[PDB]
Amino acid sequence: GSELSERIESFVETLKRGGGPRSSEEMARETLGLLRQIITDHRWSNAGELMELIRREGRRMTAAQPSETTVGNMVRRVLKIIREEYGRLHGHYAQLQSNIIEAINELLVELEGTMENIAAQALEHIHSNEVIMTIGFSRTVEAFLKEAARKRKFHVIVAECAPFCQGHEMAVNLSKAGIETTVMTDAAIFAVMSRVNKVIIGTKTILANGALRAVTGTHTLALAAKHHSTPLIVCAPMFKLSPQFPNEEDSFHKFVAPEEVLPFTEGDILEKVSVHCPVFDYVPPELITLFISNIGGNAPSYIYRLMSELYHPDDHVL
Amino acid sequence: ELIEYFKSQMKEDPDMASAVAAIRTLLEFLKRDKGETIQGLRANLTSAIETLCGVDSSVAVSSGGELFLRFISLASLEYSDYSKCKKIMIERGELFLRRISLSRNKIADLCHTFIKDGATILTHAYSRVVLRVLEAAVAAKKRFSVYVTESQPDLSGKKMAKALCHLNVPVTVVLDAAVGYIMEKADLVIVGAEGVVENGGIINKIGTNQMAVCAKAQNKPFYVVAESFKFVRLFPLNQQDVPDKFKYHPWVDYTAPSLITLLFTDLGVLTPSAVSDELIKLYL
Amino acid sequence: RFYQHKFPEVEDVVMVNVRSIAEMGAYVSLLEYNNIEGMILLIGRNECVVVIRVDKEKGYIDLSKRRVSPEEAIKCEDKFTKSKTVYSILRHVAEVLEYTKDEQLESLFQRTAWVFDDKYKRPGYGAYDAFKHAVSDPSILDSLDLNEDEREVLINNINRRLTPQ
Amino acid sequence: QVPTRKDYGSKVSLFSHLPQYSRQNSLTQFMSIPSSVIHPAMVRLGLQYSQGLVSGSNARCIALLRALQQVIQDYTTPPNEELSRDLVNKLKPYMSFLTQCRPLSASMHNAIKFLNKEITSVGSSKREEEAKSELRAAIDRYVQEKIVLAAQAISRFAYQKISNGDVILVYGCSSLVSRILQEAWTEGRRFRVVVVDSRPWLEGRHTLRSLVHAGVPASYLLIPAASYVLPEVSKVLLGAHALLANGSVMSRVGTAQLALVARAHNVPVLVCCETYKFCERVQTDAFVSNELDDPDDLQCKRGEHVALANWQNHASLRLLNLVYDVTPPELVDLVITELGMIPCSSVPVVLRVKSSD
């Protein structure tokens, strides 16, 4: 049909435009709905031509912007879904249409209960009269603190993720439920972690090797929390885990325009000085301690089995 | 009946590794002096060749033998005659040898896109596995100078320099004690293991522990390479734990197990605490 | 040892308890004999296992669950109950004046081979379990023995308290 | 008709989950000498369990398990009625009596989850007397295979992992550490075992008196003199109470203290655990699940002045002795479980060893 190509080009144009739309969960839902439409584009004799089809399309998806991985790894788990269906006909033509339909239907359903399960396991970790530390927001963190503030009392402090700021938008978003939170500059975090006791990080992309590819500022805060030995928790779901690898990927960083750091009222200074700022930094697996997920918390090393059982381990080639 | 067959493969062919030579030795030595039974043949002659092969001071040999005995254990059927227990079911061993010869190709394919340009490299003594990954990295049209150490039970590192200048990269050898003199110069310290054990420990030659303690001294990531063979099944704690027969003036020491950062094999990339996860996946 | 057949041949179905594991399975020496050890193909409890292959000069036998899924039991309990009635008395014995440390190895089976289990047939000791509940049951016990019948060993083997069968 | 339980004196605000409870009151001042709900052998072994002679984790699990054995050895379910849900509807209020008699040590929580697993497995249209018989057979074969076969396998690993000319310390208390040390000793090995304890308890006098009746030399001191022993020892053993999901050895009062001061002078640590001693939930540190024993037991017999005697008259005064505490994962090196010498962070692999997958 003509509809498939125009709507996937609508998604690659809202991909190439940059940051946005709304969040990764809208990315999940709409990319899953588009791939729901794709498995009803046209028939296929055996699995291989659908695989080259979806492989080429997800290949362009990853290649058009290597910044995030949500569409990439939902394509990869659709690939292990057909791989186990391929296993569950020889273990080509019976009900594979309806089977992949119901498969991604339960994928949708377990996606829309993700942050609510996060709110369920949000309780036991933080205490009362204690202080938690966040850099920017994922809406995971919003559901987290919104659940855990409704029955206890704590004191969240937040240093924003400001090449350009959006942690102040987190601050004004959660402050209208009144947890008595404070904000500070991004370079005052080191002294104040003598009086913190635990820290979360709301990340966006987590990779295979236990490390995490979060917003910038998380590396220096991770090293500062190392030099005070407070525990490190990362509130990412199992959903946005990636199999990719740090220097296997040629500069997984993505810089944005340095207008947000050196503004364009600069005078004559500009044309002899390089200026660059990432959105995404890299912080080793050595330093986190406690995942939380849909099924419960896991070790920093234990995301390895989550990769190997949640992804067919040779779809590293998208 | 096979001991100089094994030593012919060993020191009249220095191409392959010692473990893969041992496993080729006994896999082609399924044509045995015929006792023709499942258990007794297996037990006495394989344990006997693992004993009688113990004139060398290596540690990969007996491990590779036991890895083969855990290979042969799995798909050994029972179908009422002593022909296809394994005496006809031997093509499994053929596919095993070719897949764990292709292992070195696949670690080269895995790690060729992993050393970044501009990063100079300091390295310990020789392997048959550092050169394939570094020349699959050079053959991706990259550029990096290399340092290497002396590694003295012998004049060793000159062999690594002669091999690698022939493989076209700028090489400079250094004295053994000059590690911390030049450790900070490096951006990347890769190490071919002798044998990898279940806690991330790398028993190896006399200076890999130097590399690890200087690596934590510099916080520079410390990467080790191993194939599917040489996962030895000991467990070490300190500097007397490994057996004395593996040692003999020592000749092997033991690095700390919990400070290396990324390793990789046939089964992909592994954080060095998933080594137990895959070793439980081994030996059935 | 209680059989004179030195190597137990094909479809001998024994339930020896598993002792010490291997890298293939478990080195299990069968309690039926003394010097016969084995194998299991892919913790310490017994199980019904048949024997498949055989050697002569080297002594290594092998055994697993080949095909024997639905098999009835009571032949095997009869097997090792008769085989355990014959250890504390009936390997060495004498025209009984029991030395209790050992008796002679070459004057060992001068009558015991012909009467207990290595007789004419498998219905041989079938009939020796059907008629001979013990020789007390009935009291018209058999003739045709190397002894008169059992004149010294009558009281001493089984006929002590009730012969409970 | 509904059991209740109160608290004793001043209480720390940081422990809203787990309260303090004093060992100096009855548990029959609210319910009679019979009870139509609660079972007599249950209150028997629970009052055994509460006062503090049933101390070891293996021992308290087998005690609770034989209590449940006595429960389902005679319990007649009345007819026109369902087996499984009514059994759990009776036995989990019994679990409430347990956790309010004395709080949970989650190995027995794994035990009651196993009991749920077994009672919902055997059906209800099945005739129930031999179902009770096979159920009691199932649970006692379960508990003997776990306890003694894990002890024999850990002893089997332990035969080789002690050198000669070395020494070793132990801390904590269980029957398995005693079996390990004497079944290491009596085979020609020659090593003296220093034994270290703490206060308010000095629990490991148990292990010391067992070890000297096994005829092994020793020397005894306390972990605030553990800065003296780190020049001498060559390997350090620990006990373990429970095994937290990211490799935290939930364990005795001064365990992680000894681990820290062990690799502060770099002598590698070694713990011991088993199969059912693994929970599901996960936590960061101490301040969630950690009991309090008696407060007033802190006492010295020196002169005429107990230096915490008048505790109750004070109100601007608090005290703590946390006993059941945690450890960061990357300083406990490895465990000796029955599956083998397996490193720390690799522990939670046993969640899906179930369906052969």
What is the distance of C-alpha D58 from the center of its chain?
7
Alpha-carbon separation of residue B101 from B26, B64, D188 (angstroms)? 15, 13, 46
**Full DSSP string of A114-180:** HHHHHHHTTTTTS-SS-EEEEES--HHHHHHHHHHTTTS--EEEEE---SS--HHHHHHHHGGG---
Mind telling me how many Å the CA of D295 is from chain A's nearest CA? Answer: 24
Question: What span, in angstroms and rounded, lies between the C-alpha atoms of C56 and C61?
Answer: 9
Domains and CATH numbers, chain C: 12-70 (2.40.50.140), 71-162 (1.10.150.190)
Question: Domain holding A249: CATH number?
Answer: 3.40.50.10470
Three-state DSSP at D248 gives strand
User: Are D226 and D335 within one domain?
Assistant: yes
Question: CA-to-CA distance for B256 and D266, rounded, in angstroms?
Answer: 11
Question: Could you give the CA distance from residue B122 to residue B143 in angstroms, rounded to a whole number?
Answer: 15
Contacts of C43 in chain D (CB under 8 A): 145, 149
> In sequence order, which ranges of chain A are alpha helices (DSSP H)?
2-16, 24-38, 47-64, 70-90, 96-111, 114-120, 139-148, 167-174, 189-192, 218-226, 303-310
D246 reaches A (C-beta below 8 A): yes
D206 and D299 in a single domain? The answer is yes
Cβ contacts of B42 on chain C, cutoff 8 Å: 24
Query: CA angle C159-C161-C163, nearest 5°?
Result: 55
A247 near B CB under 8 A: yes
A204 by Cβ neighbours in 10 Å (0-12 / 13-18 / 19+) ranks as buried
Which residues in chain D have their CB less than 8 angstroms from residue A127's CB? 14, 16, 287-288
Burial of B277 by CB count in 10 Å (0-12 exposed, 13-18 middle, 19+ buried)?
Answer: buried
Residue among D13, D247, D284 minimizing CB distance to A198: D284
Contact (CB, 8 A) for C145 and C115: yes
Interchain CB contact of B259 with D (< 8 Å): no
- When CB atoms are compared, the residue of B113, B116, B269 closest to A208 is B269
A289 near A233, Cβ under 8 Å? yes
- CB of D167 closer than 8 Å to CB of D192: yes
C-beta separation of A317 from A244 below 8 A? no
Q: Which residues of B touch D270 (CB under 8 A)?
A: 237
Q: Name the residue of chain C whose CA is nearest to B38's CA.
A: C62
Is the previous residue joined to D34 through a cis bond, with omega within 30 degrees of 0?
A: no
**End-to-end CA separation in angstroms for chain A:** 25
Q: Would you call the peptide bond into C8 cis, given omega within 30 degrees of 0 as the criterion?
A: no
Cβ neighbours of D149 in C, within 8 Å: 43-44
Q: Which residues contact A162 (CB under 8 A, 6 or more apart)?
A: A186
| B119 inside 8 A of chain D by CB | no
In words, the CATH class of domain B3-106 is mainly alpha
**Measured between CB atoms, which of A125, A127, A297 is closest to D245?**
A297
Please tell me whether residues D18 and D115 are part of one structural domain: yes
- Burial letters A7-32, b for 16+ CB under 10 A, else e: ebeebeeebeeeeeeeebbebbebbb
Residue ending a domain, among D99, D118, D153, is D153
* Cβ D224 vs Cβ D198: under 8 Å: no
| Tokens linked to A290 | 């406690």
In angstroms, the CA B225 to CA B129 distance is 8
Give residue limits of the domains in chain B. 3-106, 107-282
Query: What is chain B written as a DSSP string?
Result: --HHHHHHHHHS--SS-HHHHHHHHHHHTTS-SS---SHHHHHHHHHHHHHHTTTS--SHHHHHHHHHHHHHTTT----SSTTTTTTSTTHHHHHHHHHHHHHHHHHHHHHTT-SPTT--EEE-S--SSHHHHHHHHHTTT----EEEE--TTSS-HHHHHHHHHHTSS-EEEE-STTHHHHTTT-SEEEEE-SEE-TTS-EEESTTHHHHHHHHHHHT--EEEE--SS-B------SSS-S-GGGT---S-EE--SS---EEEETTEEE-TTTHHHHHHHS--
CATH architecture, domain defined by B107-282: 3-Layer(aba) Sandwich (3.40)
For C145-157, letters b (16+ CB in 10 Å) and e give eeeeebeebbeeb
Tokens describing residue D331: 């300083």
Residues of D in contact with C44 (CB under 8 A): 149
In 3-state terms, what secondary structure has residue D257?
helix
CB–CB of D242/D105 below 8 Å? yes
DSSP state of D292: B
Domain extent, residue A147, equals 119-309
- A206, A219, A253, A286: best to mutate for the B interface, most B CBs within 10 A: A286
Method: cryo-EM
Q: Which amino acid is at A84?
A: E
Which two structure tokens, joined as six digits, stand for D141? Answer: 């074969």
Please give the interface size between B and D, counted as residue pairs whose CB atoms are below 8 Å apart. 33
Q: What are phi and psi of A299, to 5 degrees?
A: -75, 165
Same domain for D200 and D239, yes or no, is yes
Q: How far apart are CA C93 and CA C153, in angstroms?
A: 9
CA angle A170, A172, A174 (to 5 degrees): 65
On the question of a cis peptide bond just before residue A243, with omega within 30 degrees of 0, the verdict is no
Both structure tokens of A55: 């492989």
Resolution in A: 4.6
CA distance D325 to D239: 12
Kind and range of the H or E element at A200? strand A199-201
Residues from C contacting D (CB-CB < 8 Å) are 43-44
Enclosing domain of residue D295: 154-356
Number of domains in chain D: 2
Least CA distance to A315: which residue of chain B?
B268
